[PDB]
Symmetry: C5
Subunit: 361 residues, 5 copies
């Protein structure tokens, strides 16, 4: 008994199978369960607000036709090249920045058909997907990225889409991201779409990504800290008159402004203020304040010298010098202390907000 005669028997010009007609026509909507296997997640760009994922898409539906009930085997794996002679549903992705099918050697496809009529359809697809990330807290944040599967041409009365009760979303073993940690939560919900044309089914899968803090420390938090320490050296060491303190102050201020511009390089231009902006602004304020402190002490020394040119005169020299030394020593102790206070509030507030986000999620 040849397989060929069976293959054209089911689907052919002698069979009444029209591939342009939905199963259960003039009937209850076609229920379709959708399964996702993630082969390779990654390539997340804040500039373009998108990420690229290579997935395996499995969708199962039951057709009343194509129930063979002849061969002694429950299921049979069929050729991928015959997938044009059946009723595949029309499933697109809403937030799509273009996608390409895989044609390495033969088509990366799969067809299976059971005795009752159940069809299993599996497709490999690279999907560039748009994620509108919110960078309110840039180095420490959780981003939720959306995958939506929708019916372009069929309203709710036909082709309803559902998720799979067990193992709807899977991930390949040992799949890692250099910048992000994928969270094994993957909350699944469905949001229907309303248009003037009609009401169309959609189902959504949500992925949670946290940011590694290892890179951001070394790149942008340690060097800014070092520049603040460099500004700190001027107070406890250099004499009141120096052609170097002004140099140290201008070099530290200029490097901080270049570093501040540096931080906003990969980042897209956005109106709101990020956490990294708050840190760089405070460090720039500290360095600027250090230069202004030296400026104030130099000016007090100028009054000492101006009065000096004009015993009774000796009484005021000591008070100006004591004032200059007093403000120098108090600056010396105060600026690392107030920097420490800023660090403990900044770090604990971002820690708590980090805990806070999961409740909304």
């Amino acid at each position: 008994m040849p397989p060929s005669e069976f293959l054209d028997k089911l689907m052919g010009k002698v069979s009444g199978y029209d591939a342009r007609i939905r199963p259960n026509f003039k009937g209850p909507p076609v229920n379709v369960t959708c399964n996702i296997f993630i082969n390779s997640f990654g390539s997340i760009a804040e500039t373009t607000m998108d990420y690229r994922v290579n997935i395996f898409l499995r969708q199962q539906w039951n057709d009343p036709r194509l129930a063979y009930s002849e061969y002694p085997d429950d299921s049979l794996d069929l050729d991928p090249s015959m997938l044009d002679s059946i009723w595949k549903p029309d499933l697109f992705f809403a937030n799509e920045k273009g996608a390409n099918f895989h044609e390495v050697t033969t088509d990366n496809k799969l067809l299976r058909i059971s005795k009752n009529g159940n069809v299993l359809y599996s497709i490999r697809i690279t999907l560039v997907l748009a994620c509108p990330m919110d960078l309110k807290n840039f180095p420490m944040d959780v981003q939720t990225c959306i995958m939506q599967l929708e019916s372009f041409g069929y309203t709710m009365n036909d082709l309803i889409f559902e998720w799979d009760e067990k193992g709807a979303v899977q991930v390949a073993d040992g799949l890692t991201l250099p910048q992000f940690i994928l969270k094994e939560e993957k909350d699944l919900r469905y949001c229907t779409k309303h248009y003037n044309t009609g009401k169309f089914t959609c189902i959504e899968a949500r992925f949670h990504l946290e940011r590694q803090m290892g890179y951001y420390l070394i790149q942008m938090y340690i060097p800014s800290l070092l520049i603040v320490i460099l500004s700190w050296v001027s107070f406890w060491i250099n004499m009141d008159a120096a052609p170097a303190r002004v140099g140290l102050g201008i070099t530290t201020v200029l490097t901080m402004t270049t570093q501040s511009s540096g931080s906003r390089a990969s980042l897209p231009k956005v109106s709101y203020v990020k956490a990294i902006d708050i840190w760089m602004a405070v460090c720039l304020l500290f360095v600027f304040s250090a230069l202004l402190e030296y400026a104030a002490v130099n000016f007090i020394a100028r009054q000492h010298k101006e009065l000096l040119r004009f015993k009774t005169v000796e009484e005021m020299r000591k008070l100006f010098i004591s004032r200059a030394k007093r403000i120098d020593t108090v600056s010396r102790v105060a600026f690392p202390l107030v920097f420490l206070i800023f660090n403990i509030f900044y770090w604990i507030t971002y820690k708590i907000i980090r805990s806070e986000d999961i409740h909304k999620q």
Copy 2:
């Protein structure tokens, strides 16, 4: 009663339906109403003078043929793969920098046909569209970007294009741009096209975009301001003779020129002068003037020393020193004041011009 026989009945080799002939041939022009749904606007580049939009294009026309008048249902949703056996009109976009159709799984298409013959055609298309933006006022401006729909092969005597009276242009809910704010005005007008070949229909949709000012402040207005403040420190603090004031002046001038080059980085090269150029030029003039002020006071001190080497001599020392201190103190008070006057005129004039633009729009 099989649907298949009906489907080939209407459009087939037994029917007299030629898909190469316009409806109402040798007759009144085919009226076509066009509806636009914007799925994802964005990716606006000043360098290439263009933006990329993913839209849904709906065009409705009435064909005297294809009026079925048989089934008890007013409208029927038909297969997308049979869209090659009918008369679609020829609609292209004039300002097009290339476009790609969507082929995720099955074709993203839609066909509906009513009892009278009304056809609804809906297509998903990513369109890179050319916008010739005018950057006379770069950080604060409104840009108008054009979408034009035109008939390539049919003159005005056939295939007239019209807009939809209600809801011609829609936008997906919660659609945002990081740099721009889309305005909910969307004025619709039609501009016919004249060629040596003929006169061809066109309709146009206009979008208004304003620029977020949050990024531009932090990136380019605050740092330039800080450099001007740094130039200001020299006057009220440093002594008349210093190997540091010249350093502070050269570092501030050099950083301002680098920042001025920095501002014109994303921007395309253009002949005219932008608002940001005016601001950077004035700040550079202020920093340069601060260095020149120190230069003038140093020169006056040189005359004091030159005369000093040559009582009657004591009379002129006081006048040179008083002249140096007087010009120093007056510089000290004057430069932030005149900077404040420049800021209030610059900001109010761009505020009023900002109000002014809407009248032309």
Copy 3:
């Protein structure tokens, strides 16, 4: 009388029309007049020596066959999808860096056919075209960019190509370039091509582009000028002994060399010397000469001090000091004056050469 029967009548399997045979076979060459409409010129890159233009290409030829002489209408607009059943000529562009046909919705094409047999063929095509620009004078120059239309497979005995006597090249109204001004001259000439395979027709269209000077002034001519002024301050202000004049000199020299590298950034690497290179070299020479002047005066002061350590001694102090002051004052007056002389010769010579180029053009 159905249009369909006429349409297959002219071009069909019952007609003797072979689309693989040229009209007037074994006869006089097929004359073809070519008309160009420029929809969007632009995107001119010196790096890749090319520009991208979106055009409308219209070519008209007469076929002795296809003369219908039946319908009461002189001309008829036919379907674009039937353009594969006729004799289109083979026209390629010689200086082509690849091109893409437009497939937004339906094919952007056009067919018309008159009573005598005249065929009008109109095609929309984006063409990346290679322009070998000569940058001898970089900021001020006129570039001539070439479009060539050639026959790949037919020698001169067949398919001769001609231009259109009136309106051969048109440009869309209100079409502008940010960097260039297109000139409304558009000289048309034909240059035949000789190969070992044969002699092939070609026709050429030439476009003249001048460079806007607005960007280049602000970006590269004003800042270099400012650096020269900064070098100038040292002479008229700073004392003979200073730990600042050396700073001002090294900062100005280093910034000029960075700016000189900056100018050659977009530019392709070329052996010959550009005008901008001449300007940056002269300004760098001026800044270097200013540092060398300070160096010479410092050395003369060193001889004054060396002789001072060793009245009769008093006689030579005055001559060394007078020599130092004299060379300082003469440097002070001379360097802006000789800079002015360089500017007037440089600007008038490029002005005259600018006038000169049109004669060759």
Copy 4:
């Protein structure tokens, strides 16, 4: 005896050869031996975690059908265009970032068929392949890059894939990489894949790449060393009071931080600390310590001057000056010595770890 009749005889509509049915249907799995020839390896990017290889893929399987047993010749080379009328297996690459078939002139393909039924299939394919490299030791490391060949649509009961016993992987003669050295080991192992759909065959080939150290020395190890030497000059030469030592210290610290940012430019952002980060951190610590040393000696000189303003006084001047000179001389000798100790431990530990890696490999 015409070849044509034989060609359609074997594979044709009169033969019972269905190309949609696997050989040995309802039988033992199809054994397939796979041979790889590497034409051009290269283009290894750490940013995208991938490499691009152009290969020749040869797979041999035996079909019980297609055994001609007629012609006197054992093997015959057949047309590449007839490769659509046979049973090619479905082989994809798991870690695939897209691939393109070669269509220069005619298809780059090959078919051979022996008397028994053995089929040889050879295909040229450029493969962008994902390599998840581990940069724990960035300049000196061995990276293992994976090629996996898998069956998309056939479970283990059919289409088993095996390697070739002799010469499974070959490399073109004189094939070199600028950055890497390919190792002639190429360990071959097979890892089966388990899915909810089924169990699918896979075979894997592993390539070992070491990094050339020539570039990294010149680019990043010699310049950082030079900056440390520059910091070293301050101790043995410059006087205790100087407006230059602070300059030399700030310039060296700022250049080291810029160089540290420079090193992490091509590199993807990663949480863990690389070897190059360890080296740059230690050199930055040395330069910072040199500036702090000068700071400490300047402060000791300040106590000497402060006590000096207030014989018995003469006794303490000598002790402060001797303390300043002693710490200066001991800094002078100590810092190159402790730098040498850091270099010998760093280099030997990376040497041993380099030897260590091969055991895991």
Copy 5:
């Protein structure tokens, strides 16, 4: 006598012409002469080790069939669209990084057929070709770039490829490269390919490219020279004690290291040392030596001052001062002289090696 009947007569279903069978089947190998016309060479990138060339490929072979011997004309130009009904050979390019066929308007192709059966086939093809350039001497070198034409599916017993005896490689008139000079030598040799599958024909064409030295002088040889001159000013001008000589030395060293990194920007990372690296290393050594010289003289002045604090004392002041002045003057004369000696050896050795290379070529 219609041409159409002749056209299907030769190649058709009534003729015995099978396009899947080689001419002279079971016979002597098909000799194929190959002619290359280079339309536009260029776009040579050291980073990707490749160049892009647009060529015309002409291959002539004799088929015993297709000898018409009917029409009074020796040769006839046939339609390009019928090139699928004949035996084109299978010619690919070995070192191929992908290629695209030209489809501007109609196919850029050509067919001619003579009375004897000679076929002329001409194709336009843009080829990105891999050139493994050796950068041992980077600014001055000759690079040899390889084009190989090979048979993918046919072993040596069939389809032998040969070059054309006269005019095998041509170049379009007035074709220039901005960076390179093409040499009119173009040595042609054939290298057969051996595989486990078989032995396959190949022929190779070699192009010689020299580098223009105009850009490299202005960009990287003149500025480094200027920095060395700047280092030279310190010796002959500045006093022994200065807060400026250290500045001039650190600025020159830092700019040289940035310029050294600058030179290796376009260049791919390679282990070996280039000529430009040798020049930048020697100039960096000179600048470093200048700073060390100032350091040594400052230290000798320190011994003079240290001994001064402790007549008999007057005797040693003169010897330390004379030692400092002597080493200063000898440094002054010596460093430009030894720089001149380095320049004459470096330039003559690269001159001779430049002559030397042609012998290997």
